[PDB]
Design a protein around this ligand. Structure first.
Ligand SMILES: O=c1[nH]c(=O)n(COCCO)cc1Cc1ccccc1
Ligand SMILES: O=c1[nH]c(=O)n(COCCO)cc1Cc1ccccc1
Ligand SMILES: O=c1[nH]c(=O)n(COCCO)cc1Cc1ccccc1
Ligand SMILES: O=c1[nH]c(=O)n(COCCO)cc1Cc1ccccc1
Ligand SMILES: O=c1[nH]c(=O)n(COCCO)cc1Cc1ccccc1
Ligand SMILES: O=c1[nH]c(=O)n(COCCO)cc1Cc1ccccc1
Ligand SMILES: [K+]
Ligand SMILES: [K+]
Ligand SMILES: [K+]
Lengths: 242, 251, 250, 250, 253, 251
């Protein structure tokens, strides 16, 4: 093993430069099976890595897990293995009334409500997606004819209080995040998720291309085929970036 | 006489314009407007000079922001009050990467917020990101005219000297916070320094307004410091042609 | 399922109030097998849950994954199901020359180099462990006999730059963390890990009891690369302590 | 030109060490006209410069534009050309009920709601005016018999949200500035303007003398619309004070 | 052979007679009272807010030195005592409870403090925990059990201010700055037991410099029940607290 | 026998006094009070010693704050509750500029806020500025007794050692934030270090109270560290004379 956590060698990658990074290690199989020749490489902790072939080119699918910390481990160790392009596919909760469940969202940049992004760049540095990756995701979304929204995402280090969920054990939200969802809503923030800020910050500050796409399964103001549309987009976008 | 506090403009003066090209220098306003059809002067107050022009039979606004976020925030807000929804900034810049040359054009995806005014619209964690349609149109226009183009992050500073780590000053010192900052931005892939983008991009992205940012390189910090007069005028003319062509796609 | 992620009902726990929380879901099977009647309950994403019995009382073993974010999900959803006591078992990298590989470390409180803890309490609030949980873990370490150190742990949101590793792709560390390891070293900080700051903060600020124990598998001052043979014996040593500590808190 | 923006050489100043620095380039000639031998030097961007004579000694008038960023350019480049004393003449909106339109305000120090000041000194450093400049301004105001208030000014990087204006496109203010005007009011802050924090901080931290004086054209507690009946007299009153204070500092 | 080995305390290392443990009350008037509970009590020095006494406990020299109110003077006292050879610190204070279940007369042992002070930042950044030494904490808790008391163990809010930082409105201005407006309620919901004014500095500076520190306090007021303390209960609570800190010192020698 | 929580004073004890001289040291209170007519001890509790004296037939309070903002904040608040509206601090200080000598008197216009207590009254951006009338009176009084005076900015620290970059300690280390801090303050023209002014000036300027700050230089950090036995009293005498003379102008 060349890496500390993923349990992979540079040879296992077969010269892959692009990697599709879902949050769920159980989704890794689903995405890899859509491409030609799916092969399981290694499964350690929350990192399941599958190698596939797209247009005659080797492509890596590797889970990041929930949150910036394990995302930062996976992305760094994949970069050590030779990956230059990272395309994230996630689930999301929309906070705008006009965004329906089932919609696909392309993130231009993220509100940094995480801690790991700070370990790569100070807060003033924008958690911006790569322009070529964003273009490929937008054009791929139009290719399969999905309802798409492009804009800013709030990337939280937590699922509950940082997304202002009150349906909890304590039933309280710390002062800092009290009324925060309404603030993001008025600022035109589309949605909540938990990985983008870290991924986009660490890639844009280290000379790596990164894209972010998500499927809406819940709208906070108001499931199978939702992932089907999004997975088809991230694979189609990968075709354009190879 | 005026609907706004600073610009000296009425909604009627705009003639239904929704797009504004926003240079920093008031002296550049007429030069940009002269490239389009039916150029007419509207107003001049403080650092805010406004001209109206026509593009593909549609009214377009040219309005100076002045140097820095504060006067930019005034101009953008008051233009939004009069009906402007799309803002295309054209500015000057100093590059900090060796591979970018003098004369090159830079399209900003998002900005490092080394300003104060952006914080008056959104907390620091909010990205100073440009609108996707605007950025696309600027990149597409740059390739259309045939120019050396770089796309990426811009450091937007409230200061010309210490915040861009210049030591050739009266004091000769840089505050601890900005000591060694240029080298950090360089390693982080930041292309350049300017003084308005962070405020403009933050206030637009957090208020439902479309904003784009483009700049011509007149100096490279890793190479020289004294720019050439002829090269400066040619660089400005190249970037102005790009921003006007980008405006065409966004009407 | 009564929760959004773990895939467990209140009935699945059988009135369990204590939970041992490892980072690695592959460790969940190992820890639960050392107790009486081990049964697998669920496995979703990075959350693997096993039910066990200790001294005639049901106990939970549930993986949090690496980092505060998923740790915050696991703890919150277990608290919804009735868990009031949390005992973290982890792996760590020691930064003090006097601490060796194979040693067991008990955390009194953590340096908050994480983001999730801020979602529960402002930075000024201490990421402190429960006194009874800390007492039990130290007493359990004294019981089975192992070289133990009690003190402060640096809990980072990252494995590399936040722990000042330069052996990376970029080879650079952000200004904020430049010379940080030396700073913590002089401050008497024992070690680096990635989950304690979040767990300790969210529990201490929500009326939940939390303890933190870790086995030293690497020392940052001398040796290079964790040995496979030493890793297994250090893991099993710390696991024995956490189960014995769970006995004292029930 | 010896400088990057002002378009001035050291010779143009003729030994001047004092500058009066208004925000509006149009006000420059009007200030210079009150002194002997007023001469235009340059006009580039928002930076217009005039040279005049006071008591047989050369004095500079130079516009900064709105905001700290362009102020920081004007002041720095003027300092390179030899200016040691900077006297700001501005306009302002009062936030205290007892301060009337037409009143003159002398700033002892500023609340730093700007970005540029941070590029010279960290937030904890006070945006304090020079004692001699402040004394001169206060004494100059007493000579002409103007209604004068001496105290703290809130210096904002923005005209609208940072001054808690809601009559805007969005009609909202970011959380940080929500209820901020009321806070400053209770704290005895006199007024809002947009250049003083930057000027005072960069001068006080670099060994340069700076004073701040402003005329009240609006009081935020009574109305919003500036009264043209007094908007002519207010500027004339304050311009006279800054010129008289310059005489005392020559 | 000397007069003072330090800048403020007016003490020589020789005055300490080999003492490594100090009990540190806030009040200089409380110094004599704590020392008189131990053998051979002698006054060493009185300068500014720093009053120092030496006493004997189980045949071992022990120091009692007042820090004064607040982190700044605490930082001077702890640093200069550390220069004189002190390696263990036990703080005994007064405090106001903010939890409804904590009564006046109860004793509180602090595991760690909310850092609402400035001086702690001069030793470690905010993210560093203001945590008490585990052995010192064990000593204080066991000492409370041994002599019998109502004891609560947990987090203390340590404020650089008595009034606004503890959300007192019955003041000259009657206002509390935005940052601290509604702060007591937040601390209450977070399970914070009490307010005092020295622990954050003491615990941060000791834990970040290899010095052992403990923190104990007697509640003379409950904020949900009253504002003005009873003069009689104050003395009884103090006496009760003084005995616990001396007994904890016995177990640390 | 007390209207307040700590000081042990009633409004009647002040006899209508509106001005207080506030040293850091309780032991110094009598020395300052003895410089005026008919000095009487009022109270001594904790680090708070209060004396009352007569100045030109008018009552004047002398009350110790103790070292640091926290106890300063208690003393100032409770004195304000008792009717004090003007506060004149007399302190000791360590100078950090080479041109300032031991024995010199420093008048503070405003303070660098290296304290915690000032934040409990006003956010960091608020200036720890002295009252203009109080500063004027202290500068005028300095000329009245004929002392060498410097007027400017003071760094007010919550600690004597690391926050003033002293390495002569038990640990021998200074936290990253204050590493190289003295040099920065020196370059910024900061005159000196003390431990009470930031809190006093901030809490007074934000609550409608008048505050002045003066200090006697007993050590200069660029020449020596141990304060002299003979010189200490000489600088104390001059500085104490100025604060009393400044009080005369403010009655
Ligand atoms: O609201 C959300 N917030 C969020 O951070 N995500 C992202 O996926 C992360 C973990 O489930 C997904 C959602 C949708 C959702 C809603 C309810 C239950 C589960 C998932
Ligand atoms: O280095 C720069 N930094 C920067 O913020 N800008 C932007 O234009 C702002 C004001 O002149 C422009 C430049 C190029 C430059 C260099 C020297 C003199 C003038 C302009
Ligand atoms: O140095 C460390 N830092 C750290 O945060 N941990 C915690 O476990 C987290 C994930 O592997 C564990 C270690 C030991 C180590 C060292 C090298 C490789 C793997 C593990
Ligand atoms: O309220 C104010 N705030 C403020 O920062 N200024 C300063 O001058 C700045 C630019 O116009 C001036 C005013 C008075 C004012 C009010 C309404 C319209 C125009 C000017
Ligand atoms: O509420 C308090 N807060 C606090 O910080 N302390 C600590 O002792 C400090 C100085 O009196 C003590 C108390 C109890 C109290 C209440 C009212 C008056 C006096 C003392
Ligand atoms: O260097 C100093 N720093 C400082 O904060 N003060 C103020 O008085 C505070 C406590 O002694 C005084 C001094 C002078 C000094 C130097 C050495 C010993 C004692 C006093
Ligand atoms: K995880
Ligand atoms: K400007
Ligand atoms: K004190």
């Amino acid at each position: 093993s060349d890496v500390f956590h993923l349990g992979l060698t540079k040879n296992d990658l077969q010269g892959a430069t692009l990697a599709i990074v879902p949050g769920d290690p159980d989704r890794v199989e689903k995405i890899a099976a859509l491409m030609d020749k799916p092969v399981k490489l290694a499964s350690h902790r929350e990192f399941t890595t599958w190698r596939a072939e797209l247009d005659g080119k080797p492509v890596i699918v590797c889970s990041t897990g929930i949150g910036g910390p394990s995302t930062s481990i996976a992305v760094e160790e994949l970069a050590q293995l030779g990956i230059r392009t990272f395309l994230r596919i996630g689930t999301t909760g929309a906070i705008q009334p006009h965004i329906n469940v089932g919609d696909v969202l392309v993130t231009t940049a993220s509100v940094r409500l995480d801690g790991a992004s700070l370990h790569f760049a100070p807060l003033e540095f924008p958690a911006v997606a790569d322009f070529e990756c964003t273009t490929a995701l937008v054009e791929a979304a139009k290719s399969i004819g999905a309802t798409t929204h492009v804009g800013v995402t709030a990337s939280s280090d937590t699922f509950y209080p940082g997304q202002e969920r009150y349906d909890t054990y304590s039933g309280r939200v710390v002062r800092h995040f009290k009324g925060s969802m309404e603030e993001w809503q008025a600022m035109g923030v589309m949605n909540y998720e938990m990985e983008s800020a870290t991924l986009l910050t660490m890639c844009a500050s280290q000379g790596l291309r990164a894209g972010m796409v998500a499927g809406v399964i819940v709208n906070r103001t108001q499931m199978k085929q939702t992932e089907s549309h999004a997975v088809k987009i991230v694979v189609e976008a990968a075709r354009r970036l190879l």
